[PDB]
Amino acid sequence: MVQAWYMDESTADPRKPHRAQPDRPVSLEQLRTLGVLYWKLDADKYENDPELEKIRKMRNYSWMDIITICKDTLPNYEEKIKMFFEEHLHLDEEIRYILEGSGYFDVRDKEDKWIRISMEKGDMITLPAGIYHRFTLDEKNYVKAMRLFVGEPVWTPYNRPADHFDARVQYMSFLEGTA
Ligand SMILES: CCCC(=O)C(=O)O
Ligand code: NI
Numbered sequence: 001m002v003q004a005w006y007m008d009e010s011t012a013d014p015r016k017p018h019r020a021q022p023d024r025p026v027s028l029e030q031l032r033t034l035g036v037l038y039w040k041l042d043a044d045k046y047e048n049d050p051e052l053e054k055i056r057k058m059r060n061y062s063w064m065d066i067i068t069i070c071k072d073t074l075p076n077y078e079e080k081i082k083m084f085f086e087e088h089l090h091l092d093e094e095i096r097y098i099l100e101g102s103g104y105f106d107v108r109d110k111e112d113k114w115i116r117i118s119m120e121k122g123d124m125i126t127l128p129a130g131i132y133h134r135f136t137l138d139e140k141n142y143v144k145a146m147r148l149f150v151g152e153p154v155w156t157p158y159n160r161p162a163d164h165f166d167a168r169v170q171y172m173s174f175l176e177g178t179a
Contacts (some may be wrong), residue, residue: 002038003029003118007106012083014136015104026115033178034107035128035171036117043099043122044145051099055124061095061148069103069137070143081154084135088157091167094133097146101137108132110175123124129172132160 004026007018024118028038039055041144045050055061071077096105101149105117118138119125137143147153162168 002028002040002120002123003026005116007114007116015139015141017118017138018139025116030109031107031115031117033070033175034109034115035131035174036107039124041097041122041124043097046097046099056148058097059126060150062151063149065147065153066099066144067147069101070142081137082179083157085131085132086159087134087158088159089130089162089168089171090131090155090157091164091165092129093150093156094127095125095148096121097147097148098143100144101142102140103145104136104138104145106134106136112124127143128174130165130169130174132162 005021006024006026008020010016010018031038041049041052041055053129056064068074069081096115096119098121102118102120105119105127106114106118106128107114108131112132113164117125158165
């Protein structure tokens with residue numbers, strides 16, 4: 001089962017787990033109240049998986065590509081990695097399907113406290129437009145991921161503060177309505 005937790009108070013070493021002490025796990029159901037959705041898939045089948053297709057059609061994820069994040073192969077690696085981990089939001093969904101390796105997506109909860117989501121092979125996640133988030137590799141320092149998008153992609157991050165955007169306003173409005 002996919003693991004998520006509240007983070008400790010250390011600001012050092014973003015790639016470590018940073019589990020709060022004592023443990024404060026976060027359920028998939030609490031993530032749903034933040035509009036964060038999750039599916040589990042057989043990642044070996046990603047080239048041809050009726051179960052992925054079901055998700056894509058339901059959600060209108062009509063666009064996809066594959067990205068591989070490691071020091072050696074990714075162009076402009078160091079800079080891209082810095083940008084991923086800056087707290088930011090987008091005007092669209094962020095949908096990522098992990099094909100190999102692993103990573104952390106951090107999201108703010110309703111009190112603006114960080115929740116760390118551990119994503120592994122087979123895990124697929126969508127972060128809603130307007131949510132403040134960031135991504136980092138974990139200590140294994142490797143991830144291969146499918147990126148999906150509702151239509152032709154725009155990747156632009158807006159680093160916090162980014163509160164004026166309609167996507168942020170609507171997302172705040174969505175949060176009033178959940179548990
Ligand atoms: C696999 C996640 C990396 C990424 O595409 C992002 O954080 O924008
Ligand atoms: Ni992002």
